[PDB]
């Protein structure tokens, strides 16, 4: 009716899940065949979150180094979703490989076993990357995103900690599919996804009928942080300040135009913190320490990712066609 938000459809891969067998997207129907937890012995801790503890492990059956993601308690439904998405996407370009699924017989805590990537913490790696290296790795992330989008899946948590890079090998893997979801046209999704600094404006203004283009806003945040050496690029103290930090750079004219296009009801607590902002030029962030990473092609690409209107952003495949990537040896 007249008070609804205006509906939205993905511009690309719109109907791909509609035309699949139901079992492809119906993760609640998925059945796990448990492996043998005794195959895996923990060697070292790698990472810990609200949802998981992650270890380097040895598969004692083949002496292979693996990674074990011990899942903190969440609905069984969410565990099947991450597993089904990983199985659907397994073998795709730069997608992490799920190797096994096991459970503690005592605590019943389930665990995902993955391909190991010999990551370098982004807080060390990114400040060492050349202009070439940034274009190269951005192109590798786009191969994963065009792949997962083409497979009807939105990642919904694109950020450095979910991008594993074995820099020795120039090997990149997009990991963490625990917040990923199947794109169905017209479906309203939870806006409480992604991480604050990488949340798209659609999530911050509570627009639920979003799509793959969310991941392209996140990727823009990563690119900005990289080329300008400013991590994170949009550093909000909360979801509301996050949109103010965005609006202070991209300006409020295109934001209000976005809110008006989709008839979004702005939470009226924005009424006193947002105001009106000029659109700044991407050149205000360029300086002696980062100028070697910045080019007209880089700023043009970033401008085409960081758009309020999700429908206006480059898709992953349109991004792969951008002049910024012409120098990447393919």
């Amino acid at each position: 009716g007249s008070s609804g938000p205006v509906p939205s459809r993905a511009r690309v891969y719109t109907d791909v899940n509609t035309h699949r067998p139901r079992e492809y997207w119906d993760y609640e129907s998925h059945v796990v065949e448990w492996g043998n937890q005794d195959d895996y012995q923990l060697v070292r801790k790698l990472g810990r979150g609200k949802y998981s503890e992650v270890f380097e492990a040895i598969n004692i059956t083949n002496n292979e180094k693996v990674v074990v993601k011990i899942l903190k308690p969440v609905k069984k439904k969410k565990i099947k979703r991450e597993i089904k998405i990983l199985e659907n996407l397994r073998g795709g370009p730069n997608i992490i490989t799920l190797a096994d699924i096991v459970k503690d017989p005592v605590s019943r805590t389930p665990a995902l076993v993955f391909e190991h990537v010999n990551n370098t913490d982004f807080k060390q790696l990114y400040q060492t990357l050349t202009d070439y290296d940034i274009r190269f790795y951005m192109y590798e992330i786009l191969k994963a995103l065009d792949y997962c989008h083409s497979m009807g899946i939105m990642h919904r948590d694109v950020k450095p900690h979910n991008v594993m890079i074995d820099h020795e090998h120039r090997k990149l893997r997009l990991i963490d599919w625990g917040l990923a979801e199947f794109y169905h046209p017209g479906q309203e999704y939870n806006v409480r996804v992604a991480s604050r600094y990488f949340k798209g404006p659609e999530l911050l203004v509570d627009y639920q009928m979003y799509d793959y283009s969310l991941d392209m806003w996140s990727l823009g945040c990563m690119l900005a942080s990289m080329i300008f050496r400013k991590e994170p690029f949009f550093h909000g103290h909360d979801n509301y300040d996050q949109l103010v930090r965005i609006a202070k750079v991209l300006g409020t004219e295109d934001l209000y135009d976005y809110i008006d296009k989709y008839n979004i009801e702005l939470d009226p607590r924005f009424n006193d913190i947002l105001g009106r902002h000029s659109r700044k030029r991407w050149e205000r962030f360029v300086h002696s320490e980062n100028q070697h990473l910045v080019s007209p092609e880089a700023l043009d690409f970033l401008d085409k990712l960081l758009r309020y209107d999700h429908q206006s952003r480059l898709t992953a495949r349109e991004a792969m066609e951008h002049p910024y990537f012409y120098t990447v040896v393919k």
Binding site: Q37, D38, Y40, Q41, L42, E53, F55, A57, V68, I70, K103, D104, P105, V106, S107, T109, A111
Partner: peptide, 8 residues
């Protein structure tokens, strides 16, 4: 020595 069922 064990954590969530896994041997060290």
């Amino acid at each position: 020595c064990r954590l969530y069922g896994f041997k060290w």
